[PDB]
Amino acid sequence: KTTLFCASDAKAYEKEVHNVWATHACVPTDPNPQEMVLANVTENFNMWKNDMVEQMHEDIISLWDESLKPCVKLTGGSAITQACPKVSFDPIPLHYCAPAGFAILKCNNKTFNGTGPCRNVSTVQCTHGIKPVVSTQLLLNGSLAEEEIIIRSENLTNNAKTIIVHLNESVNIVCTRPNNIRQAHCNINESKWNNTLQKVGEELAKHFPSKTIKFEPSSGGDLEITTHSFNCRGEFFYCNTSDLFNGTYRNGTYNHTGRSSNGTITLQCKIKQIINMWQEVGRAIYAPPIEGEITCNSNITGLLLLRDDTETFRPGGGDMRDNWRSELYKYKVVE
């Protein structure tokens, strides 16, 4: 429909790079914005074909190119070389705002699966604050569904279509390279993982009725999608998830099958310098890791799954727009 603009809450004295970018590219946020219900209106949205996602994707690409410059960038046969300073890197929330003459409709149905008609609807200047968090397999630091877990998919029959599971309760994941310099690990409380895959299996079961629901670690691909990869404090972690996506939900009960220990699942992570870019088809080389404890304490707030009697779900990811979709699903720009 139109060109959106961003409102952030960053300040010009942070050397953190999301702050720097936002202070150049975004306008300050309205202290008290004002909504505008319309609980009879009913309009349709389709999260899977939402231009707001394109615009945000463009902006995050811009952000990363100005903030996480790689020492080397291989695209086609070209290699570009730049200074790759280590930087202060912690994502801040970004608001997307409709400019003069445009408004953002926001669907208020707390169970809205993200496509089709929605009943309660509001008008807003801006989205909520969205932390543009690049990762695969697990979505981190998002907003939780407020009712029940919600399964989103462009077409649940088409197994080639990424499924976004929207959790209603955070699950902590703590990743640390402590004080091999490239080796780290993550801790998830196996009990709350336990429960979470319980409930996720229930919801997947309503969509998949005759069948037993198996979680299995991702088959093949680049490391960035066969492991839970993400950026912590500038460094690209790649964490093994085969003790995480490893479980069976059969008789209305979930049985976890990956190996736990003293009540917590522990993922082996590598920090890596040679990255398969999400922005485009290419490779990006970075400097070896900073020193000391690198630690990220994050909320797993959704999953990205792919489906292959039994239905099997393995972790997925790689198309960063799905991350943005998970947060922008309940908004469209109109007028």
Ligand X SMILES: CCOC(=O)N1c2cc(CNC)ccc2[C@H](NC(=O)C(=O)Nc2ccc(Cl)c(F)c2)[C@H]1CNC(=N)N
Ligand Y SMILES: *[C@@H]1O[C@H](CO)[C@@H](O)[C@H](O)[C@H]1NC(C)=O
Binding site for ligand X (CB under 6 A): 134-136, 162, 222, 224-225, 229-231, 236, 275-278, 280-282, 318-319
AA identity, residue 75: T
Task: Give min distance, CB of 232 to ligand X, in A.
Answer: 9
Cβ atoms of residues 8 and 63 within 8 Å: no
Residue 278 site contact among ligand Y, ligand X, none (CB < 5 to 8 Å, cut-off depends on kind): ligand X
Binding of residue 257 to ligand Y (CB under 6 A): yes
Task: Give min distance, CB of 117 to ligand Y, in A.
Answer: 7
Nearest 5°: phi and psi at 83?
A: -65, 135
Applying CB under 6 A, among 158, 179, 180, 251 the residue interacting with ligand Y is 158
Cβ proximity to ligand Y, 55 vs 141, nearer residue:
141
Q: Which range, of 1-9, 146-154, 186-194, 276-284, touches ligand Y by CB under 6 A?
A: 146-154
Residue 318 site contact among ligand Y, ligand X, none (CB < 5 to 8 Å, cut-off depends on kind): ligand X
- Nearest CA among 319, 334, 286 for reference residue 81: 286
- Nearest CA among 262, 271, 292 for reference residue 187: 262
Cβ-count burial of 220 within 10 angstroms (0-12 exposed, 13-18 middle, 19+ buried)? exposed
**∠ at Cα 257 (253, 258), nearest 5°?**
140
Task: Give min distance, CB of 84 to ligand X, in A.
Answer: 15
Cβ atoms of residues 213 and 249 within 8 Å: yes
Site string for ligand Y, 268-307 (x = CB under 6 A): ----------------------------xxx---------
CA–CA separation, 224 vs 270, rounded Å?
11
- Nearest CA among 41, 221, 249 for reference residue 241: 221
Side-chain-facing half-sphere of 11: CA atoms under 13 Å: 2
Q: In what order do the strands lie in the sheet with 121-124?
A: 121-124, 103-107, 331-334
Binding of residue 14 to ligand Y (CB under 6 A): no
Residue 10 site contact among ligand X, ligand Y, none (CB < 5 to 8 Å, cut-off depends on kind): none
> How many positions of this chain bind ligand Y (CB under 6 A)?
38
Query: Which residues are near ligand Y by CB under 6 A?
Result: 91, 113, 115-116, 133, 140-141, 148-149, 151-153, 155-158, 168-169, 199, 202-203, 216-217, 223, 226-227, 230, 232, 240, 242-243, 246, 257-259, 296-298
